[PDB]
């Protein structure tokens, strides 16, 4: 899944990091990884086999999970990036 | 999945921790994360794309998995929270 | 999934390592592990239950994910092995 790098930057998701895609439009759920897309383009591209399940026009949720030590897990404040219909950042929430 | 925090407390599952949901009513199985819900409300809310698979009225099992060292894994006693039809705690079992 | 070991060598995927298979032909997505196949045979064999979802003639993508420390994750350059219709290596890309 190619993602406008501005969005990866705001989310704190690294290129090549594994991410789950939960499709709001059709309910599909899959695991793949993120690739950096042209900054400011608002691109969200589905490459490969995933194209069978996630289609252009679909509304999706990209989620990244990490492995935490007991201490860091209890202090974790997840980052949530909210975007508009063109995938431009509207707001970023912390924990 | 928003979960009455009293239940998260009893289970030892942290807010934002990844959890699997296995649907007893329809057989759906998915991975998502837990969010703290109002204490004592008995809330079990399905937000986002997961709503396509898990419906209000469904009976479900929420399971959390951790990564253990050899020693801790052999001494592990999983916590099981049993609840009633209103999601109130009936009993908590250890290992 | 039995894989020509020349391909495992080029990819840096170890025998017995867990791998996901994303089917380009039919959209199936599953998790299994790799087994070393005869070198130069170009074998890509689906053994066991996975045979229900991935069929001979299918085009697939085999992906391996690792668990990284913060530092190594930021310097990671994934290996991509491109092959022909007989599963012979055409090119190997780095990051």
């Amino acid at each position: 899944v190619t993602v406008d790098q501005d969005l990866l930057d705001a989310a704190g998701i690294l290129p090549f990091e594994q991410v789950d895609i939960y499709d709001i439009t059709n309910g599909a759920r899959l695991t793949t990884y993120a690739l950096p897309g042209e900054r400011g383009s608002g691109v969200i591209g589905i490459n490969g086999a995933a194209a069978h399940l996630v289609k252009p026009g679909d509304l999706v949720i990209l989620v990244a999970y990490g492995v935490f030590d007991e201490e860091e897990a209890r202090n974790l404040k997840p980052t949530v990036v909210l975007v508009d219909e063109r995938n431009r950042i509207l707001e970023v929430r912390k924990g | 999945v928003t979960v009455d925090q009293d239940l998260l407390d009893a289970a030892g599952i942290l807010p934002f921790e990844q959890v699997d949901i296995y649907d007893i009513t329809n057989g759906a199985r998915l991975t998502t994360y837990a969010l703290p819900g109002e204490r004592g409300s008995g809330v079990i809310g399905i937000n986002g794309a997961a709503a396509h698979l898990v419906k209000p009225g469904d009976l479900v099992i929420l399971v959390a998995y951790g990564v253990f060292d050899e020693e801790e894994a052999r001494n592990l006693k999983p916590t099981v929270v049993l609840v009633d039809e209103r999601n109130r705690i009936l009993e908590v079992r250890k290992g | 999934v039995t894989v020509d070991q020349d391909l495992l060598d080029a990819a840096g995927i170890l025998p017995f390592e867990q791998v996901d298979i994303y089917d380009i032909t039919n959209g199936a997505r599953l998790t299994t592990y790799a087994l070393p196949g005869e070198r130069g045979s170009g074998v890509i064999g689906i053994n066991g239950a996975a045979a229900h979802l991935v069929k001979p003639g299918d085009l697939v993508i085999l992906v391996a994910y690792g668990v990284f420390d913060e530092e190594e994750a930021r310097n990671l350059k994934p290996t991509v092995v491109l092959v022909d219709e007989r599963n012979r290596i055409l090119e190997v890309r780095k990051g």
Binding site: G12, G42, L59, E70 | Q18, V67 | -
Partner: peptide, 23 residues
């Protein structure tokens, strides 16, 4: 014990393109 936790997400993004047969 190490815990697997949700650390980040991009919410309600719109898919703009797809390429099943890319390389």
């Amino acid at each position: 014990m190490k815990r697997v936790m949700f650390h980040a997400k991009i919410h309600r993004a719109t898919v703009t393109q797809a390429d099943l047969h890319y390389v």
